[PDB]
């Protein structure tokens, strides 16, 4: 008869090739509801620990009781919006119109960009406002970058740059909001965007594992029984039928596994603090000691320690926000042992 069975692995994350940018790029943004604001932030993965929380769920028969929750510690120091990019609507989608930059640059932004020495902020601003007058102004986003130097456990000083969208009330209002942030020095923090208890979407390039077989890469079975002793242990039965006489790309084969971008949905932000309250004893293995701006993400986060991870207010949350959850205990017990 041959019993049915789902295929091995999702065909929705392909091609399973190495990622073009180690820095994640969201392909979606939250809707323009509330007041004007930057729709995302970034940080660096540190490690994991657990925390005891007070059941916050109003529908849980345990609401109000202790509860142990896993948490990923992410160092989230301030970032800097160094410019405001404007897009115009055209018959061929959105396209970058212009950009408004600043003059106050972080000491080592030149490790990545050819920092501007001569720019006309006003003209750009003008061009943008004219476009808006004509009604061709497409969404507005800020070119942002991090300050790895602010994070010791992270070797790199070369900042990571990524564009984040700015959603706000009216286009005029948030446009201004954008310009204001930038003009200053673009310096902003996790607090300015997220509040503990809110759900965010965390993107990141998963841990790389190089080339792997079908079994690990797609989760196909291993040869079973006698079949396992004949000369085949981790190779599939066949690459396909006689006809079509070609190998379909839908058949699980070997390749690059790991180091792929993934936007993990609805991650609850258990807490945003600063200091060394979350650090473990002995130090986060292969990472270091945390002591500064941090975020505690419920559960796991794609990527290995030290990798850049991005935050975005959840685009498709299932639950309502339950702000500032009570944290009764944060484990500092050594991750070694």
């Amino acid at each position: 008869p041959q019993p049915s069975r789902p295929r091995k692995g999702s065909l929705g994350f392909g091609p399973r090739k190495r990622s073009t940018s180690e820095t994640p790029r969201f392909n979606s943004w939250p809707s323009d509801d509330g007041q004007p604001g930057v729709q995302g932030f970034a940080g660096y993965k540190a490690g994991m620990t657990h925390v005891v929380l007070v059941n916050d769920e109003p529908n849980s028969p345990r609401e109000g009781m202790e509860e142990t929750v896993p948490v990923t510690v992410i160092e989230t120091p301030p970032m800097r919006a160094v410019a405001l990019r404007a897009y115009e609507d055209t018959p061929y989608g959105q396209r970058p119109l212009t950009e408004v930059w600043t003059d106050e640059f972080h000491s080592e932004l030149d490790r990545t960009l050819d920092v501007p020495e001569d720019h006309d902020p006003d003209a750009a601003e003008e061009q943008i406002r004219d476009a808006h007058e004509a009604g061709d102004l497409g969404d507005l986003r800020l070119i942002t970058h991090t300050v790895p130097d602010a994070v010791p456990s992270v070797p790199k000083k070369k900042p990571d740059v990524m564009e984040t969208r700015v959603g706000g009330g009216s286009v005029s209002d948030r446009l201004d909001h954008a310009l204001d942030i930038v003009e200053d020095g673009g310096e902003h923090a996790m607090n300015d965007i997220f509040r503990a208890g809110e759900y965010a979407d965390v993107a990141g390039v998963t841990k790389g594992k190089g080339t792997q077989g079908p079994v690990k890469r797609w989760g196909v079975q291993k040869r079973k029984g006698k079949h396992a002793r004949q000369g085949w242990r981790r190779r599939i039965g066949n690459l396909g039928p006689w006809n079509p006489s070609r190998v379909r790309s839908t058949v699980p084969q070997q390749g690059q596994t790991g180091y792929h971008q993934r936007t993990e949905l609805n991650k609850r932000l258990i807490d945003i603090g600063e200091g060394d309250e979350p650090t473990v004893d002995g130090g986060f293995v292969n990472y270091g000691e945390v002591d500064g701006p941090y975020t505690l993400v419920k559960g796991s986060v794609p990527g290995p320690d030290k990798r850049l991870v991005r935050f975005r207010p959840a685009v498709r949350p299932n639950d309502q926000p339950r702000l500032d959850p009570e944290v009764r205990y944060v484990s500092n017990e050594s991750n070694q042992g």
């Binding site: 657990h50 142990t68 205990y329 484990s331 017990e333």
Partner: protein
């Protein structure tokens, strides 16, 4: 809580609770102790154990 074996404090959100045949209960703070116990050893006779200390 305190480990019913070695006697050190069991880190919250950690450990296993073994329920005996009779119904008795034994909280272990680690596999190390569970295993030393399954070997039939008594925490008092092990010098590294806080009990013994």
């Amino acid at each position: 809580r305190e480990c019913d074996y070695c006697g050190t404090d069991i880190e919250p959100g950690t450990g296993t609770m073994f329920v005996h045949k009779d119904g008795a209960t034994t909280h272990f703070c680690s596999s190390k102790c569970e295993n030393n116990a399954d070997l039939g050893r008594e925490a008092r006779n092990l010098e590294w154990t806080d009990t013994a200390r």
